[PDB]
Design a protein around this nucleic acid. Sequence first.
RNA 1: AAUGGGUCAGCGACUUAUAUUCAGUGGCAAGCUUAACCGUAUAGGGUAGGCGUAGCGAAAGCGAGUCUUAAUAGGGCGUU
RNA 2: AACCCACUCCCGUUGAAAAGGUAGGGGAUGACUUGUGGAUCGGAGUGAAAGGCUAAUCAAGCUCGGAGAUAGCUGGUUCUC
RNA 3: AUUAAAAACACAGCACUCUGCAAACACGAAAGUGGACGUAUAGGGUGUGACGCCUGCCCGGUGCCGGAAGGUUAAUUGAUG
RNA 4: AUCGCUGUGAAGAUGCAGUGUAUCCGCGGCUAGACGGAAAGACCCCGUGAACCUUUACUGUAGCUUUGCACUGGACUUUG
RNA 5: GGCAUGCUUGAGGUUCUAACUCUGGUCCGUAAUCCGGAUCGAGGACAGUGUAUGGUGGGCAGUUUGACUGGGGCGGUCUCCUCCUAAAGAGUAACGGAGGAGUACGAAGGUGCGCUCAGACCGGUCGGAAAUCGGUCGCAGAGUAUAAAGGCAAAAGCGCGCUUGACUGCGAGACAGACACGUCGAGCAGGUACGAAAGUAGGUCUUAGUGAUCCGGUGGUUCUGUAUGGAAGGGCCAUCG
Lengths: 76, 50, 96, 63
Amino acid sequence: TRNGRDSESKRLGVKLFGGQAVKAGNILVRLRGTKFHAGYGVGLGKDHTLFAKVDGVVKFETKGAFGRKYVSIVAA
Amino acid sequence: RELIRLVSSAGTGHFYTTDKNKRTKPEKIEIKKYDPVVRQHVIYKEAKIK
Amino acid sequence: GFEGGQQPLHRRLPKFGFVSLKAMDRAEVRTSELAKVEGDVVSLQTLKDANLINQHVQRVKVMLSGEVGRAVTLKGIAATKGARAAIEAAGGKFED
Amino acid sequence: PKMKTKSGAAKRFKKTAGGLKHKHAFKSHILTKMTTKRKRQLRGTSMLNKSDVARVERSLRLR
RNA sequence: AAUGGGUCAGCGACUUAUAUUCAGUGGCAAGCUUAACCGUAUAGGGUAGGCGUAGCGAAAGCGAGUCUUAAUAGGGCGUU
RNA sequence: AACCCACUCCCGUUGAAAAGGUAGGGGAUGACUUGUGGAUCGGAGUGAAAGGCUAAUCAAGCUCGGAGAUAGCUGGUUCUC
RNA sequence: AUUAAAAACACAGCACUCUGCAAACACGAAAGUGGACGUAUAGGGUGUGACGCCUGCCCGGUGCCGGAAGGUUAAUUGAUG
RNA sequence: AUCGCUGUGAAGAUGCAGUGUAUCCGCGGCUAGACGGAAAGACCCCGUGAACCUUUACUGUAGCUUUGCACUGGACUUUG
RNA sequence: GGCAUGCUUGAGGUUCUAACUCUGGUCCGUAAUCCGGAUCGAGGACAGUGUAUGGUGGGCAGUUUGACUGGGGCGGUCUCCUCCUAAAGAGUAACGGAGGAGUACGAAGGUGCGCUCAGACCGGUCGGAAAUCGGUCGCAGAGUAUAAAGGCAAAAGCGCGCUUGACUGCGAGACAGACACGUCGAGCAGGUACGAAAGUAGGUCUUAGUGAUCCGGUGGUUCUGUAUGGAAGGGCCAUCG
């Protein structure tokens, strides 16, 4: 019945938007279960964190079947 | 889940530490694990942390 | 130290070691200083005759921090590898 | 000597030429819950960052 | 229509000591500086001691490196 | 009646009075009233008990020290651009 | 004492309980002193409060009194490892 | 150099706005206002304030009590 | 089995007198109800006192007795996770609206190989809407250890075979962030799982499942080790309360 109780608001979402230069370890998307999928040179960590495996710029392409949003890094 | 100790079958005194549900799996654990003091994989077989 | 009432840093982090009583009488004298003693010898009492090292020091190591200048003799005094090289290069010698 | 360093601060913060060293919390007495990756990364002796320096070396009587 | 003061004239509140840090300003400079004390005594002497010339490590120790490490790999701190 | 007390009203409240006056009231041979001298004193006395009293002071007198206690509180902080 | 004189306190009477005397008890680091130059019809504590009629039930809690002797249990002992 | 009203306003105005009244100054009275005067609100809150009382709060202590070892001995008997 | 006794010791009872006690008598100091001394008496190794120790002990003492709060008291709530409020990046308050957690798991982990769920339908000789299947339509609505949200075909769902990577040392670089904490992680070295091999594997679909320091305990250790050789204690590393 009685009612308080929130939690500490985990700061999720898109870091490193769609034209930005990335280094080879940077967190792309903090994610709660794959909104965005792992593209060309990006990694998919344990808690579905997208991180960069190479350098370049972020792409954010909507590719393929299943309508999936991909974060990929184009070496440019 | 009371915690146990898994000591190395090799001659060292190296131990990995974990839990176990005693009232469902009471027999001891003989899992092959990596010992750093000899630097090979050996069986670990122990309980009784005290 | 007081942080308003939370646990301050000097009570929240652990204590980490001991001080050696072995090293209260320890000393180091670098190679820039060995030309400053008189008498073409670097001894413990000779390093105390100049003010290069305190009284109540007993162990001196010589390390390499410059140029030795002269050809001095180091009795009873340890030296590092590069410092023994640079002392014996410019005419020095070494006994005990 | 007419300034007393806090003795609990001297046991916690050894001074080097790189700053003031300290050890980490959480590596005591609850070490099965933690992964090895957490116990590996609290093991060393870290530096003391900017927000803490003025307070610690005011406690360690150096300001 | 909150406090304070009837008014005047006197008085009445960031000091001092000792340790230290930063700035400014001087002296000496890989060195600088003395404390007690001595002194026909603000001189001169007294360099014991303090800080600097090297760091790393909890330490032994080793040292332009050192610690961790199985590692001459990585990494931390350091080095005209 | 003296004496001792203090129930009521009114006055007085900057009083004649830091607890009274005037009218009335209670006891008045007793568990009475009183002089003089003495005893008990500060977590300590004495109390037919009310936290009463202990020098106009009392849920711990007064004075002097620790002492310039302490105050995250209040008040104040003095010439000029 | 100085806003409460009362239904409050006290009281004779009552009951409980303690105390065999160097008393229980009180004040006293103690000596001592009060109780008391008294002695159970005395003395302390407690509650009730003349008188008249009375004063019911409960011994689980807690206290107080007595009881075996079983478990527990302190210093001190100091076997053995 | 101290009016009334209606507003306004730290929100109940002699002092603000607008507007009415009102020659200057006493004396005797009366108290409706000057949130009148008297007491750094007693109620309420707050202070990591205090005091004193309570207890089956915590921690102790006086006193009372148990045993050991001293002061403290011999002699017998029961007994391990 | 023990016969007997002494060389002893430990607990009781009774007795004795000599310690001790007497707020008993009588002398004496002395002209003294004090106090000593002598003696008689009585108790008696008890009493009592010192020290150690258990018990009792508001008789007395020093304290404590939380905060938030539409004033305070009462109730409720304090840490952590999920959604809304939250204004389409983060963040964002209320005694605002809703729910959860203080764990499970040695397989519910790893890997290789394989496979899709659920639902209507129509089928009556115990179940009759229903179990077991044969799936035509199907058309993610199933499942996921657990709340909610977000995700799942390379399924992250499901089955089987092997198995320990629920490794050690680290760690480029980021996310978060006052600090202490926290989150993700390519790669490198050493050894291993599976797989023919590319490769995957540093736990679990993801985010809760927790707790600083100081004290102690335990196992190592290259370190220290108060004259020296050792120990004691300390230090570091791992771990427990």
